[PDB]
Design a binder for this molecule. Structure first.
Ligand SMILES: [Zn+2]
Ligand SMILES: [Zn+2]
Ligand SMILES: [Zn+2]
Ligand SMILES: [Zn+2]
Ligand SMILES: [Zn+2]
Ligand SMILES: [Zn+2]
Ligand SMILES: [Zn+2]
Ligand SMILES: [Zn+2]
Lengths: 362, 362
């Protein structure tokens, strides 16, 4: 007997189009999403060209509208040159993305003053999310307080980070955060198996104590999000391995396994993959949209999942329980038992729906 | 005709005793202070052993009382093991020092949670100062707000940092800061002359734009302090150059030169080398203590100053105007024209004076 879930939302995916389409494109990435029981994705701006200006956004929107099989919103990315220039297109984006650590020359910010400039100029009602590790979390929280607005912290990976966020919440500060599945289900203990190439990810895999702290502090975690970051095996195993794991197809099965084991409830999962993503990002409902899962089916994750062009997975060999059987998206069957049945272009830009605009004072 | 100044205070010196006495000791460092018109110093805890517990403090206090020629207070250093253990000795120290960037294994803090622990456990009325560069400034400011207390930022060196502090002050946050002379009078332009060994310092020398930003934002700077960090020329020119410049003997002459040129006023200098150090650290007055300077005397800084055992200086070849002629400390002539006339042990621990305790509620 199947359990019906609402359409789940992944607010952190890298779909690689434009410019990296050997790694993934909108059509393949959204197929991966559907197979993972996800019906709406928020795509990150670190493409080539990066989505850091109106023309790049315009290109990305058309590519997504033509290629996406599920619904989507696109992030804008903060650069060292675009603060104060995104006003006219800001409302059309998922939100603004700040890359506060490593980064490519284009999204690199070299001074906290540039962060402040973005917080001051980006419309105050629209989401801001940050890649912020370790002390960077504290630093970006400070910038948010100086400018008296909220911030969302991507992929919390460490005890240090989740305890900091916990303390901020206890003081009533407007901060929310997300955790990715690799930081709940993999740790240092897995690096021997993965190797130094495949195992490369940012934030890096944590200690068993980091992983335990995230579970113990589940109340502090607002969202789960995959940080789906596909790279080919050639790239991961090559001389300069880029960081990132694919994750869309494995996220829900891993979490359903955890639910089956009583590590969190079905409600806890649905807050973090549906209700909280909606409310933090003001994403609209999807009419006639639902996911049917089989919670009894035991299987072992294989060396690669069917849809992502990454064609590998760091979870290979893990035993899980729970599988996506059927997805319906806006009244059409989108996925059944390993077959995606909606074509590239079926997906729509949710920010163009009347219900998908973020409310604001005139 | 000479100008009489009050006894100046340097709240950031490394005197290297115990454990590094080839670089400097209390007697040589305080001779250097007196020759620079400084009558009270606050000595940092990164000695060997480091001053991170009661026994180490007890040793350092006796060595200082036996060796110091001017008056002093000693900082305690925060470690990964001593939060919540310094309560009984805290009031006897200058304050608590947090080393938030590089550091030796002993003062290294590995998580922002450890910073929070120190802010929560150190007595709330006593000073906390931090070595905090770039985004670390924002991060430690966040920790200070979470724990609702003040913080003092050591050696601000960059435009980024001074503008951040400026923004924090504009929001009424309790933050103060200090700037060292090398970050006002040296820049990248000097690295060719200094070389990569001698030029090694933390925070590193800034661009001309960093230097200009510090001057333009002088209103934001509460104190000047030397970060006197003596190392021998052998060390600076060797294979693994330690960071740091000696500075006690050159700080006042460089600043007097700037006053003579109208870059700041005599009052601005005396706020930053006397009144603000007193009030931030609650340091007591020194009876019958004053410094006589000749503002007309032009000279060129030589390859080493007379007293510091560092026996080199990064300011060699700079033309200055202004010199210390006479220092009187507590009614005794301590320095005249290149001769120190008070012996090692003349200096006292100001925290033991009845007026030198930090006021607190019972
Ligand atoms: Zn990220
Ligand atoms: Zn994210
Ligand atoms: Zn990402
Ligand atoms: Zn519900
Ligand atoms: Zn320092
Ligand atoms: Zn300092
Ligand atoms: Zn120092
Ligand atoms: Zn005065």
């Amino acid at each position: 007997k199947l359990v019906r879930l609402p359409g789940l939302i992944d607010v952190h995916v890298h779909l690689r189009e434009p410019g990296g389409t050997h790694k993934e494109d909108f059509a393949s990435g959204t197929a991966a999403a559907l197979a993972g029981g996800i019906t709406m994705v928020c795509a990150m701006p670190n493409t080539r060209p990066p989505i850091i200006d109106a023309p790049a956004l315009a290109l990305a929107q058309k590519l997504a509208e033509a290629g996406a099989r599920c619904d989507f919103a696109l992030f804008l990315g903060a650069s060292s040159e675009n603060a104060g220039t995104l006003g006219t297109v800001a409302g059309s984006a998922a939100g603004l993305k700040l890359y506060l650590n490593e980064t490519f020359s284009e999204l690199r910010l070299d001074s906290v003053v540039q962060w402040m400039e973005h917080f001051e100029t980006w419309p105050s009602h629209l989401p801001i999310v940050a890649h912020a590790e370790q002390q960077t979390v504290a630093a970006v929280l400070m910038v948010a307080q100086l400018t008296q607005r909220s911030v969302h912290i991507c992929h919390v990976a460490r005890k240090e980070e989740i305890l900091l966020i916990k303390a901020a919440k206890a003081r009533g500060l407007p901060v929310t955060c997300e955790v990715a599945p690799h930081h709940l289900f993999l740790s240092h203990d897995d690096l021997e198996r993965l190797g130094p190439g495949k195992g490369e990810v940012r934030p890096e895999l944590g200690s068993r104590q980091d992983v335990e702290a995230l579970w113990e502090n589940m109340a502090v975690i607002d969202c789960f999000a995959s940080d789906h970051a596909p790279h080919t095996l050639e790239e991961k195993c090559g001389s300069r391995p880029p960081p990132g794991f694919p994750g869309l197809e494995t996220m829900l099965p891993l979490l359903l396994t955890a639910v089956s084991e009583g590590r969190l409830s079905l409600d806890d999962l649905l807050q973090r993959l549906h209700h909280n993503p909606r409310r933090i990002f003001h994403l609209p409902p999807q009419e006639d949209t639902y996911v049917e899962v089989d919670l009894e089916h035991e299987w072992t994750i294989p060396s690669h999942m069917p849809f992502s062009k990454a064609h590998w997975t760091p979870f290979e060999g893990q035993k899980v329980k729970g599988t996506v059987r059927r997805v319906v998206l806006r009244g059409e069957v989108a996925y059944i038992d390993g077959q995606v049945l909606v074509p590239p272009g079926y997906g729509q830009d949710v920010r163009k729906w009347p219900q998908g605009a973020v409310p604001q004072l005139p």
